[PDB]
Each structure stands twice: as C-alpha cells, then as structure tokens.
Design an enzyme around this catalytic site. Sequence first.
Site, PDB file in Angstrom:
ATOM      1  CE  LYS A   1      -0.592  -1.572   3.904  1.00  0.00           C
ATOM      2  NZ  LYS A   1      -1.356  -2.197   5.181  1.00  0.00           N
TER       3      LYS A   1
ATOM      4  CG  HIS B   1       0.447  -0.965  12.202  1.00  0.00           C
ATOM      5  ND1 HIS B   1       0.877   0.240  12.389  1.00  0.00           N
ATOM      6  CD2 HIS B   1       1.151  -1.430  11.267  1.00  0.00           C
ATOM      7  CE1 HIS B   1       1.464   0.705  11.534  1.00  0.00           C
ATOM      8  NE2 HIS B   1       1.731  -0.492  10.696  1.00  0.00           N
TER       9      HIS B   1
ATOM     10  CD  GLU C   1       1.583  -6.431   8.877  1.00  0.00           C
ATOM     11  OE1 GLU C   1       0.930  -7.519   8.827  1.00  0.00           O
ATOM     12  OE2 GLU C   1       1.410  -5.678   9.724  1.00  0.00           O
TER      13      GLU C   1
HETATM   14  C1  LIG Z   1      -1.299  -3.493   8.802  1.00  0.00           C
HETATM   15  C2  LIG Z   1      -0.639  -2.327   8.347  1.00  0.00           C
HETATM   16  N1  LIG Z   1       0.870  -2.836   8.214  1.00  0.00           N
HETATM   17  C3  LIG Z   1       1.871  -1.802   7.874  1.00  0.00           C
HETATM   18  C4  LIG Z   1       1.311  -0.558   7.404  1.00  0.00           C
HETATM   19  C5  LIG Z   1       2.617   0.117   7.065  1.00  0.00           C
HETATM   20  O1  LIG Z   1       3.054   1.277   7.916  1.00  0.00           O
HETATM   21  P1  LIG Z   1       4.286   2.037   7.348  1.00  0.00           P
HETATM   22  O2  LIG Z   1       4.392   2.137   6.050  1.00  0.00           O
HETATM   23  O3  LIG Z   1       4.684   3.281   8.006  1.00  0.00           O
HETATM   24  O4  LIG Z   1       5.286   1.095   7.808  1.00  0.00           O
HETATM   25  C6  LIG Z   1       0.262   0.040   7.603  1.00  0.00           C
HETATM   26  C7  LIG Z   1      -0.220   1.451   7.275  1.00  0.00           C
HETATM   27  N2  LIG Z   1      -1.399   2.063   7.832  1.00  0.00           N
HETATM   28  C8  LIG Z   1      -1.412   3.605   7.914  1.00  0.00           C
HETATM   29  C9  LIG Z   1      -0.697   4.422   6.889  1.00  0.00           C
HETATM   30  C10 LIG Z   1      -1.188   5.657   6.643  1.00  0.00           C
HETATM   31  C11 LIG Z   1      -0.980   6.133   5.030  1.00  0.00           C
HETATM   32  N3  LIG Z   1      -1.229   7.593   5.173  1.00  0.00           N
HETATM   33  C12 LIG Z   1      -0.898   3.876   9.283  1.00  0.00           C
HETATM   34  O5  LIG Z   1      -1.545   4.522  10.474  1.00  0.00           O
HETATM   35  O6  LIG Z   1       0.578   3.885   9.465  1.00  0.00           O
HETATM   36  C13 LIG Z   1      -0.815  -0.967   8.121  1.00  0.00           C
HETATM   37  O7  LIG Z   1      -2.078  -0.885   8.170  1.00  0.00           O
END
Ligand SMILES: Cc1ncc(COP(=O)(O)O)c(CN[C@H](CCCN)C(=O)O)c1O
Lengths: 349, 349
Positions: B44, B162, B239
Amino acid sequence: NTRDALCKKGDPFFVADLGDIVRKHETWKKCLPRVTPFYAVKCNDDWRVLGTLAALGTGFDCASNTEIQRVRGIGVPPEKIIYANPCKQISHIRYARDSGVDVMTFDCVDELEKVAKTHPKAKMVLRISTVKFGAKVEDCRFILEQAKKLNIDVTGVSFHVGSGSTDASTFAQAISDSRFVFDMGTELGFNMHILDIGGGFPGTRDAPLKFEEIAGVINNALEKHFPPDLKLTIVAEPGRYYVASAFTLAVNVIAKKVTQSFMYYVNDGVYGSFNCILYDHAVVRPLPQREPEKLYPSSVWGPTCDGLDQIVERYYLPEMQVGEWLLFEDMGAYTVSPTIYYVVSGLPD
Amino acid sequence: NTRDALCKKISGDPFFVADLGDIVRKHETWKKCLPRVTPFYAVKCNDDWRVLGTLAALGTGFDCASNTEIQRVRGIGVPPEKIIYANPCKQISHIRYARDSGVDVMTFDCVDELEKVAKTHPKAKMVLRISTVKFGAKVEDCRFILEQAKKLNIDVTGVSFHVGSGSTDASTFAQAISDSRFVFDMGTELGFNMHILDIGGGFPGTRDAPLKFEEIAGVINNALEKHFPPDLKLTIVAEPGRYYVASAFTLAVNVIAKKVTQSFMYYVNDGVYGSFNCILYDHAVVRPLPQREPIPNEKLYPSSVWGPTCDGLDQIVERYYLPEMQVGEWLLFEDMGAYTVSPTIYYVV
Ligand SMILES: Cc1ncc(COP(=O)(O)O)c(CN[C@H](CCCN)C(=O)O)c1O
Ligand SMILES: CN[C@@H]1[C@@H](O)[C@@H](O[C@@H]2[C@@H](O)[C@H](O[C@H]3O[C@H]([C@H](C)O)[C@@H](O)[C@H](O)[C@H]3N)[C@@H](N)C[C@H]2N)OC[C@]1(C)O
Ligand SMILES: CN[C@@H]1[C@@H](O)[C@@H](O[C@@H]2[C@@H](O)[C@H](O[C@H]3O[C@H]([C@H](C)O)[C@@H](O)[C@H](O)[C@H]3N)[C@@H](N)C[C@H]2N)OC[C@]1(C)O
Ligand SMILES: Cc1ncc(COP(=O)(O)O)c(CN[C@H](CCCN)C(=O)O)c1O
C-alpha cells in the site's frame, strides 16, 4: 425514480439522476436570468453530466488542459469555454490557444507576461480578491497599466467567494468591487464587457444560506452596479449547484463489530468517493436501504487499513448486517471506484 | 546518481526519480538491525513495479491488504506463501480471491471476521491482531475471541499488532510485544498452534525522523528476547512500508507561475490532488529544494509553493525561505516515495 434503481438491485455503485440536473438548470434560469452558467468541470467531470449540461445550453469552466480536451471532446465549441485558472502552465496556455479557447483569467502581472508570449490575442479576465488567488483592488490599477504596456486585451472582471459562506453580503461586496475595477479597465481604454461572479452556490437545501436568498442579493447588487446592457455579458462558474444532489452513492457493509454501539465497514471511503471529507469539508449521512427500530450509535469506515479512513463518526442507525447496503445522498460534488448508473426521472421522453 | 541524473533530462511535466539502490541499502540495514525479523512489504505504501520486483529479488515478503495488491504481487511471479493478507476486515469476495490465489495467511481482530472466514476460507492460517480505534482487538477480549475461533474451528497461527509511525517513544513496541506473548500463550493454551509473531510497521523511512530506526530495532530486539527467545518453530515477521521506500523517491516539479509582494509565492504542476496528497492523508511535511545548486550569500526570501489546482487548499509549502525562482525552473522534493504514488517515474539503479 432513483429510490428504486437501487431498490431494484456487491461492489459500491453510483446512481446519477440526470433529471435532477435539468431541474437545477431551470431553477437557475429562473433565479438568475441575467447570468449565464459556465459549469466548473472540476466538480464532477462525468460524461453524461457534461453532455446533459451541454444540451441544456450551458457553458463550461475548464481549469486545465485536460478538462478543455474533455469538454471539446463532447462537441462543445471553444467559445463556450472559459479557462478560469489564474496561474496556468505555459504548455497548457498553448493547448488552450490551439483549441480555440480565447477567454482566460489572471490575477497578477506575471501571468500577463506568459500570456503575451504565448497567447497574445487572448481575451483576459481580471479575477479579484473577495489567499491563493484574486488580485487585491489596490493593486488592480498597477496591474491594468502593466497589461496595457503588454498590449493585453482585458475583457472583464471576475471573483469567487467559495462555498464557505454564511452571509450573502460577500457577493454584494465582490460585485461592487467588480464595478470599481471594471471602470478602471474602461478608463484605461480597455474593452471591459464581461462580469464573472464565480461559484459557491448551494447544491442542496441542506445548507442554511439558500440559493435563492443568494440569487436575490446578487440580482440587487447586480442592478445597483451592473444595470442591463447589451454590450455587457454576465456569467458565473457554478460547480456544486448543478451536481451535488444528483448523485446517490450505494456502499455495501463488508464487516461489522459490536460492543450497545456498532462499527460498520463499507467498501468505499476517504481514498475514494469520500475523499471529499478531507478535500471538501463534506459531512455525510449514512442512509439504510431498508425500510424504517431500536437505533444505536454507530460509525462507518472505509475498507482501508488507514485509521483515518473513517466515513461517519457517531450516527444513530438500526443494527445492520454484513452484505446489507448503505446509501449516501448528495455525493455528486467533488466525489468522482464506484461504477456510475444514471436515471432520468420526471421527464417527457 | 540522482542528485545528478535529474541534472541530465532537464535537457516541463513533473517526474519522479527513483533510486532502486537506496532500497537495496534499506534492506541490508534491516537484515542487520533485525536479523530475526522477516520483512513483508506493505504494498500500500508504494506499489511501483520496480519497487516490488526489487524487493522480491531481495528475498522479501509482501503485505497485501486488498485483492488488487495480491493480484499485483502474484503478477510479478511472487509465490502465495510470501504474501500476508494483513487486512483485518475483508470483503468476502476478496477473501474468496485470496483463497483462489493460494494466500492462506490473513489477519483478524473480531469474532465476526472469523465467521466470514469459516464460511469462505476454512483452512486459512489466521493471525489475531491486537490493540496497541479502527483495528486491533483488546487483550481483555482476546480470550473470548479465541474461544469463539475454537468453536469455529479456525486455525489461529499467531499474533500481530501495529503501532504506526506517530511514535516519539519506542516503548510502545516493547509493550505491544509483551502483550503479544500473553495472547500468544492463550492461543497455545486453547490448543492453538501459535507460531507466528507479526510486529507490523511504522519504521522510519527518512533520516529526518527524531526516533531512529536503530534505537527502535534495539528496543524491539530486547523485548523480543525477553518474550520471544529464539525457537525454530517460531517465525517473526513485520509489515514495513515507509522504511523501504520513503527516501528512494525524489520528485521534480516545474515552477509554472509566480507572484511577488519582500516575499514570494510559487505555483508548481503537482500538488495535493496528486503526489502531495500525502500532506493531507499522511501528515507529510515537505521541503522544497532548488535543482540549481546554491551560490553564495544569496538572498533568500520567505516563499510558499502551490499546486496547479483552483482549490485554495491545494497548497504544498507554507513559508519556506528559498532563492528567487523563475517560471520554468525546477523544484525538487526528496523523500517522496512513501504514500505518494502519474508523474512519469524514472529509475536509477
Ligand atoms: C497493517 C499495516 N501494516 C503496515 C502498515 C505500514 O506502515 P508504514 O508504511 O509506516 O510502515 C500500515 C499503514 N497504515 C497507515 C498508513 C497511513 C497512510 N497515509 C498508518 O496509520 O501507519 C498498516 O495498516
Ligand atoms: C438534510 N438532508 C436532506 C434530507 O431531507 C434527505 O431526506 C432523507 C430521505 O432521502 C430518506 O429517504 C430515502 O429512502 C430511500 C432509501 C432506499 O431508504 C430512497 O428512496 C432515498 O434514499 C430516500 N428517499 C429518509 N429515510 C431520511 C431523510 N433524511 O434528502 C436529501 C437531503 C437534501 O440531503
Ligand atoms: C531534507 N532531506 C535530507 C537531506 O539531508 C538531503 O540532502 C540534501 C541534498 O539532497 C541537497 O542537495 C541536492 O542538490 C541538487 C540540487 C540541484 O540542489 C539535487 O540535484 C540533488 O538531488 C540533491 N543532492 C542539499 N541542497 C541539501 C541537503 N540537505 O538528503 C536526503 C535527506 C537525508 O532525507
Ligand atoms: C474558479 C472556481 N470556479 C468555480 C468553482 C466552483 O465552486 P462551487 O462548485 O462551489 O460552485 C471553484 C471551487 N474550487 C474549490 C472547491 C473545493 C473542492 N474540494 C474552492 O476552494 O472553492 C473555483 O475555484
């Protein structure tokens, strides 16, 4: 009816009532007979929406090279387009020229320099302030003089108050100011014959300041400062007025969480049709596609892992069930991911 | 080099310069600071093709949160086993797609999800995600949830959590891991084959972050030793999203319009309705960077950058001291690879 397109038939989908647009127009031609509408394509660029507005004899307010390409694509003639973006990218200004679009806006000398070098014989409209756009009145004299030195064909004035209006006086003042600057242009030998009143007109009865209490205040000031004149042409750039209520969004509840309050998850949200909650200050109302219970405080959420992807916060709804649909009305403005189905009601084949 | 291959093709649409090598370096640093943790890239964050292929080749796993992300990853030859459908509340037709694609590891945080799973993907290895509002089951409700999963004959294979990127203090990671042990035991206690620990994401991607990745890996490894000592049956994953791509992307925008007042305002051909949606969606704070290296005691003036859109909210920078720029000149934005991506992208390897 829409009320049964949906009730006739699990990905989210849009039901667009074109007839609601035709009705929006009639109400416009009635409350503002002197003002010709140039539809702010940015609000909703749906094909049928543009074609419908075209057929209704409306004009189009394009703010980019693509919007112009789009409008020109449905057969609309260049004359009916106003490149209403003040600060334009040269290659774009170039595209407008090549497309026959000769009316553009501006609010600073700079833009004029670009125009002089790229589209000399362009009819330019001076947009005035009512932060990011709109020249202050105090700097207008200097701007016009410079446009003179640049041999720019300045054909009018324009402004934009926006939709965050509680009071319509703003329209009255902007129009008074437009006269003032209108005179200066005329005073410096400029052929001032166009008045653009912008947009920001309510697309729903939902908002306190009625369209009609607005058209009223506008017509008053428009009479005290811009009395009828065949040489004069008055236009506006309405966006949400024509499409907000014409679109109804249907989302499917994809997951639930109980606790007595509920949490429903739908297959569309802020990273889609609901980007309007963040970009346009939209406040939406979930509406069951079920006939009317003990109601409990709920909350709706987008299908995304983002904790910000929240659609509704705390709204009383009946207990819903995964697989059941949820509707959102007044989702045609700055919302368009959901396929789009159109409906033409109350109208003579 | 980027800093210079940008300072090559500028020989005026915005474009991205992606340094794949910066990713390969991010990985090495990961395998070093967290040797026990296998990374599953949160697609994502940036689903660029080369980015995924590069990560694939580096032997990384992929964290897909939708049916499309899965289709995408599966598209570049990545085997199902290396994918984790880490979206708690999934749409049935999607859960169905995962099954049909061979993706057997999914997360959940409520009984409900389990019901859907039981009916659609019975033999799925399920990971229970715990709280650290939208996602994550509270510890207090975990016992009840597991029991129900038992009654549903669900193969619960682990725990996950998370914290996100809004962390000032790494303790959060320590506490979430302690909590994960607790719930891990309950699962094992109810005859559940608990052998997976997912520590999520939220790891710095930029060197501008107060909290260093390395002060984090440290606190993680500590708690990971006090609660999850090595074990061949145990598998620890994460993740990571922004960690791997934030600094790998550098955005080049062209100044399309200018205005003076001593202060300046600049308009570029990209903004919030594009690559800069991250200012509204991801709390991004960006830094404009001239592509014209500096000179001396240059006079710098307070400026502001703006998107090409008529929206007064489409503002990129508010008040940043920059040298006087000129229409047609480029402006750069570094650390724009995370939650930002069609400006054509160019790759440097
Ligand atoms: C289950 C899960 N695992 C990994 C990630 C990745 O986060 P990062 O790329 O910081 O490591 C996310 C990203 N969700 C939003 C992201 C908000 C987007 N604007 C957040 O609040 O960090 C997630 O929901
Ligand atoms: C203040 N918001 C107004 C509000 O008056 C609203 O009325 C709705 C009305 O549409 C709903 O009734 C709904 O019923 C069915 C739907 C399948 O259940 C549909 O035909 C359609 O959505 C609507 N008629 C009613 N149940 C609640 C009011 N708030 O109508 C639209 C609006 C302008 O946004
Ligand atoms: C704010 N981002 C920080 C920052 O340290 C940055 O280094 C930049 C550096 O890239 C810039 O230097 C820049 O020089 C030219 C440009 C013509 O000026 C660009 O072509 C090039 O991409 C870039 N290296 C320099 N002017 C300031 C440092 N803080 O490097 C990335 C980073 C560590 O995340
Ligand atoms: C030149 C110009 N002409 C017409 C309209 C149309 O406005 P309305 O649709 O209210 O009539 C707008 C509205 N653009 C955004 C709207 C913000 C979108 N998120 C704003 O900030 O007002 C505009 O800038």
